[PDB]
Design a protein around this motif. Structure first.
Motif, short mmCIF file in Angstrom:
data_model
loop_
_atom_site.label_atom_id
_atom_site.label_comp_id
_atom_site.label_asym_id
_atom_site.label_seq_id
_atom_site.Cartn_x
_atom_site.Cartn_y
_atom_site.Cartn_z
N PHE A 197 -6.09 -21.57 -12.38
CA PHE A 197 -7.04 -21.63 -11.29
C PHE A 197 -6.51 -20.85 -10.09
N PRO A 198 -7.30 -19.95 -9.50
CA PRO A 198 -6.87 -19.32 -8.24
C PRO A 198 -6.77 -20.36 -7.14
N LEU A 199 -5.99 -20.03 -6.11
CA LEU A 199 -5.62 -21.02 -5.11
C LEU A 199 -6.85 -21.69 -4.49
N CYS A 200 -7.96 -20.96 -4.37
CA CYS A 200 -9.18 -21.56 -3.84
C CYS A 200 -9.64 -22.73 -4.71
N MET A 201 -9.77 -22.48 -6.01
CA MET A 201 -10.19 -23.54 -6.92
C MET A 201 -9.15 -24.64 -7.01
N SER A 246 -18.27 -13.76 -5.98
CA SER A 246 -17.25 -12.72 -5.92
C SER A 246 -16.36 -12.94 -4.70
N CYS A 247 -15.13 -12.46 -4.79
CA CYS A 247 -14.18 -12.66 -3.70
C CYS A 247 -14.74 -12.18 -2.38
N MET A 248 -15.49 -11.07 -2.40
CA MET A 248 -16.12 -10.59 -1.18
C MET A 248 -17.09 -11.62 -0.62
N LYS A 249 -17.90 -12.23 -1.49
CA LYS A 249 -18.81 -13.27 -1.04
C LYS A 249 -18.05 -14.45 -0.47
N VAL A 250 -17.02 -14.91 -1.18
CA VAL A 250 -16.26 -16.08 -0.73
C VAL A 250 -15.67 -15.82 0.65
N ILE A 251 -15.12 -14.62 0.85
CA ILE A 251 -14.55 -14.28 2.15
C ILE A 251 -15.65 -14.23 3.21
N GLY A 281 -13.94 -21.63 0.43
CA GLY A 281 -13.47 -20.37 0.98
C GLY A 281 -12.13 -19.96 0.40
N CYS A 282 -11.72 -18.75 0.76
CA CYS A 282 -10.44 -18.23 0.31
C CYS A 282 -9.32 -18.80 1.17
N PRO A 283 -8.36 -19.54 0.59
CA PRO A 283 -7.28 -20.07 1.43
C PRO A 283 -6.53 -18.99 2.19
N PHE A 284 -6.30 -17.83 1.57
CA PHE A 284 -5.56 -16.77 2.25
C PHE A 284 -6.25 -16.35 3.54
N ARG A 285 -7.58 -16.44 3.58
CA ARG A 285 -8.33 -16.06 4.77
C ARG A 285 -8.62 -17.23 5.69
N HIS A 334 -5.14 -8.06 3.88
CA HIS A 334 -5.45 -7.79 2.47
C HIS A 334 -5.18 -9.06 1.67
N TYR A 335 -6.11 -10.01 1.79
CA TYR A 335 -5.95 -11.29 1.11
C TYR A 335 -6.03 -11.15 -0.40
N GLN A 336 -6.85 -10.22 -0.89
CA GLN A 336 -6.90 -9.98 -2.33
C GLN A 336 -5.54 -9.54 -2.86
N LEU A 337 -4.85 -8.68 -2.11
CA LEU A 337 -3.50 -8.30 -2.49
C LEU A 337 -2.57 -9.51 -2.47
N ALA A 338 -2.78 -10.43 -1.52
CA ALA A 338 -1.97 -11.64 -1.49
C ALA A 338 -2.18 -12.47 -2.75
N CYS A 339 -3.44 -12.61 -3.19
CA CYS A 339 -3.71 -13.33 -4.42
C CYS A 339 -3.11 -12.61 -5.63
N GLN A 340 -3.13 -11.28 -5.62
CA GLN A 340 -2.49 -10.53 -6.69
C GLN A 340 -0.99 -10.79 -6.72
N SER A 385 -7.09 -5.23 -10.92
CA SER A 385 -7.58 -5.35 -9.55
C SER A 385 -8.38 -6.64 -9.44
N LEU A 386 -7.73 -7.69 -8.96
CA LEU A 386 -8.38 -8.99 -8.84
C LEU A 386 -9.56 -8.91 -7.88
N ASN A 387 -10.78 -9.03 -8.41
CA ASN A 387 -11.98 -9.00 -7.58
C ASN A 387 -12.97 -10.09 -7.97
S1 SF4 Z 1 -8.46 -13.85 -3.18
FE1 SF4 Z 1 -7.68 -15.46 -4.59
S2 SF4 Z 1 -7.72 -17.37 -3.33
FE2 SF4 Z 1 -9.03 -15.85 -2.24
S3 SF4 Z 1 -11.13 -16.26 -3.02
FE3 SF4 Z 1 -10.26 -14.62 -4.35
S4 SF4 Z 1 -9.35 -15.75 -6.10
FE4 SF4 Z 1 -9.70 -17.30 -4.46
#
Ligand code: SF4
Ligand SMILES: [Mg+2]
Lengths: 435, 296
Positions: free
Chosen positions: A263-267, A345-350, A362-366, A398-404, A419-421
């Motif tokens: 699970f990505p950190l958001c989930m 999509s990550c763009m939507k979540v952000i 939401g995205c924890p990194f953001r 660059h939160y996507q890079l942080a998740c990567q 490319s995690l998107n």
């Molecule tokens: S970048 Fe990672 S933590 Fe942020 S919304 Fe995408 S998958 Fe979730």
RNA sequence: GGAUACUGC
DNA sequence: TCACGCAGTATCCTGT
């Protein structure tokens, strides 16, 4: 009639009046018993699920009868050896189950019900000729009038049966029944009575037949319960008969496991909050539901998971079906516009709804302050260098890079290679690496 | 109403006499009063089963009307003994009661004629049967069910009758014998037709728009609109298939969506009326209507 | 989370 | 130039 056959099994349907007299093997005994238990359980399940007149009921029952090789259709060929075998099966199995289903009134009732259902179905599959044959072989004597007597009462018969044409009537043959059995017909005066007999043309008759059958069967079961002590002494057949009624004939749980790694950190945050409080605000509900749809959780599976998770939150069980069922269905494109809504999509979540106090979407990194993100990363046993690198990336927007980087560190891979998107992309990559 | 408004204006934002504190206090005192009354009833070893801001329903657990009245008087006096100007009175004696949810119940009010005799009058409060947003057909069905539930017939027979009626309804729908007037659903407009941003999702609004597109008198906020749900081959959700009755009588491609009316108008109402009655459950009701009992 | 209805007190 | 209060149940929707 190959080697050791006879006229013992004239017709497919029978009232099961005469017990078998053969010497069979223990293997045959067990096979027949279990097979008829399967047949009766299938009958019960189909009766519960479907209406017995429904076409689905008929199709499924025919499929089961074919699978277990029981007599269900007539054959205007002759008594073929195979057919004989099938009929023999039916006849022996029935009585075996009688021995199994006579100990307790409950059991008796169950048996009777299933048997009646099966019999009804089979009758429903009998052609008129075959039907008459059956009605004769058992001395039911439901008419059949002669042609001469038919001409004798031609006009009376014509005026008796509703909507019967002269020639069409000439093409039909009636039956003579005592009027005590045609109550439902005589009472509204829709069948001619002559000298105590009704002249019934070729739906209700099955009812009378069934009544007779039921009477007989009940009597038989009583007698069997009276003859139980003779069988209990046969250890070979005790384990079976005494216990036949109790004879055997992605997962939600693993979701938590996935939350550990894939699970990505958001989930992960959403799941942690859900299991901590058994309740999510609307944004969290939408995000987590869409993600669980993405991983593959089917509508039934998602409904079960959400029901079980929310029921612990001290809310009425019916309230869930009242309120959240529609939302869960809609996420899967079941209602409303009926669109297969894609996972966020990550763009939507952000750029989606900004979380506030009491929210966890939401995205924890953001949406997490740098100190909070540092604490969370430390909690997950991430190496100090990795935590510092993730924080540096976060400061770079660059939160996507942080998740990567998170994926690289947690999966022990030097480079992510993708490319995690999409959070579903994260879960898919984790599953590919692990499994 | 005038008096009640003299109260309510105290909490009217755009009133010349906005005194929100005072109104709050009023309500608070009312709550306190109700609480006290309930407590007193329980101290009298009676049973309290409902109350809406000024009322209490007591289960007398008796069948001798005279005795019930006696008890009334007694408790009445007791309550009055605590207040100077406030008074409590017997607002009705229900022979039978069907209490479904908060502010949703039905009863047979007992009007005494004399010499111990009394007549019974059916009374409904909050049930869908007394709401204008349901198809008249369904309403009538529910009314029948209520008349069966609140009577004195043996329960089994009651159930039987209910089944019969429901099956009748099913047939009357399948053959299309029911008068078209009974298929209408009425809804009022809070705003003008244009202001709604869900012209598609909201059915009544859709109908209003069509009317305004026609060449007759326009429909504005506060004007009730009557619509029917039909079939057109669009394969869209019911909310998007609303049509004016005249339109149905005119166009040669629209037919009443029997299924819908049997599935989301009659069945829900009946089920909610039969929830506390033993022997009737959603599944069964659906079966009696000819619906598939699988998804119910 | 939002939107649309209308019952009760 | 307008418009009484609040408590409660029922139904339906969330793409560019
Ligand atoms: S970048 Fe990672 S933590 Fe942020 S919304 Fe995408 S998958 Fe979730
Ligand atoms: Mg909510």
């Amino acid at each position: 009639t190959g080697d050791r056959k006879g006229d013992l099994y004239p017709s497919s349907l029978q009232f099961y009046q005469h017990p078998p007299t053969e010497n069979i093997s223990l293997i045959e005994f067990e096979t027949f018993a279990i097979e008829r238990l399967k047949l009766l359980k299938a009958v019960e399940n189909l009766g519960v699920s479907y209406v017995k007149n429904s076409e689905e009921y008929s199709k499924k029952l025919e499929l089961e009868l074919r699978k277990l090789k029981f007599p269900y259709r007539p054959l205007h060929e002759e008594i073929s050896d195979d057919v004989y075998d099938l009929r023999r099966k039916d006849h022996i199995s029935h009585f075996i189950l009688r021995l199994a289903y006579c100990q307790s009134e409950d059991l008796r009732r169950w048996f009777i019900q299933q048997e009646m259902d099966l019999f009804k179905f089979r009758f429903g599959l009998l052609t008129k000729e075959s039907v008459q044959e059956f009605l004769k072989l058992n001395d039911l004597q439901y008419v059949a009038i002669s042609e001469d007597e038919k001409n004798m009462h031609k006009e009376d018969l014509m005026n008796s049966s509703f909507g019967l044409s002269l020639t069409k009537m000439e093409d039909t043959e009636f039956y003579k029944v005592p009027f005590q059995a045609a109550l439902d017909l005589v009472r509204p005066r829709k069948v001619f009575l002559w000298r105590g007999f009704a002249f019934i043309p070729h739906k209700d008759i099955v009812s009378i037949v069934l009544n007779d059958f039921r009477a007989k069967l009940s009597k038989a079961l009583a007698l069997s319960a009276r003859s139980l002590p003779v069988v209990q002494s046969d250890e070979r057949l005790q384990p079976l008969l005494n216990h036949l009624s109790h004879s055997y004939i992605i997962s939600l749980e693993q979701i938590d496991g996935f939350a550990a790694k894939s699970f990505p950190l958001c989930m992960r945050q959403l799941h942690k909050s859900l299991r901590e409080n058994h309740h999510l605000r609307h944004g969290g509900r939408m995000q987590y539901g869409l993600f669980l749809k993405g991983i593959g959780l089917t509508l039934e599976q998602a409904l079960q998971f959400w029901r079980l998770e929310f029921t612990k939150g001290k809310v009425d069980s019916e309230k869930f079906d009242k309120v959240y069922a529609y939302s869960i269905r809609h996420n899967y494109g079941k209602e409303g516009k009926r669109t297969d809504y894609t996972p966020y999509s990550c763009m939507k979540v952000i750029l989606s709804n900004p979380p506030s106090q009491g929210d966890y979407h939401g995205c924890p990194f953001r949406h997490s302050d740098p100190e909070l993100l540092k604490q969370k990363l430390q909690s997950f046993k991430v190496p100090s260098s990795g935590i510092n690198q993730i924080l540096e990336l976060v400061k770079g927007m660059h939160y996507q890079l942080a998740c990567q980087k998170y994926f690289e560190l947690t999966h022990s891979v030097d480079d992510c290679g993708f490319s995690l998107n999409h959070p579903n992309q994260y879960f898919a990559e984790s599953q590919k690496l692990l499994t | 109403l005038t008096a009640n408004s003299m109260y309510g204006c105290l909490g009217f934002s755009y009133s010349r006499f906005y005194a929100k504190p005072l109104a709050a206090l009023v309500t608070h005192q009312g709550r306190e009063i109700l609480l006290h009354t309930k407590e007193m009833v329980q101290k009298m070893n009676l049973e309290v089963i409902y109350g809406d801001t000024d009322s209490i329903m007591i289960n007398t657990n008796c069948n001798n009307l005279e005795e019930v009245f006696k008890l009334g008087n007694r408790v009445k006096s007791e309550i009055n003994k605590s207040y100077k100007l406030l008074e409590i009175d017997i607002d009705g004696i229900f022979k039978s009661l069907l209490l479904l949810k908060k502010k949703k119940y039905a009863a047979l009010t007992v009007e005494p004629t004399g010499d111990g005799k009394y007549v019974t009058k059916q009374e409904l409060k909050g049930l869908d049967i007394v709401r204008r947003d349901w198809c008249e057909l369904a309403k009538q069905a529910g009314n029948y069910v209520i008349s069966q539930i609140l009577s004195d017939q043996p329960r089994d027979s009651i159930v039987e009758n209910i089944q019969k009626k429901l099956t009748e309804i099913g047939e009357n729908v399948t053959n299309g014998t029911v008068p078209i007037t009974q298929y209408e659903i009425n809804k009022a407009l809070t705003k003008d037709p244009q202001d709604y941003p869900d012209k598609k999702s909201l059915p009544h609004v859709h109908v209003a728009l069509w009317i305004n597109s026609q060449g007759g008198r326009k429909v504005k906020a506060g004007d009730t609109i009557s619509y029917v749900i039909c079939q057109d081959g669009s394969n869209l959700s019911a909310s998007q298939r609303a049509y004016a009755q005249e339109q149905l009588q005119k166009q040669e491609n629209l037919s009443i969506d029997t299924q819908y009316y049997l599935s989301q108008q009659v069945h829900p109402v009946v089920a909610r009326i039969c929830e506390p009655i033993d022997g009737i459950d959603s599944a069964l009701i659906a079966m009696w209507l000819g619906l598939d009992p699988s998804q119910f």
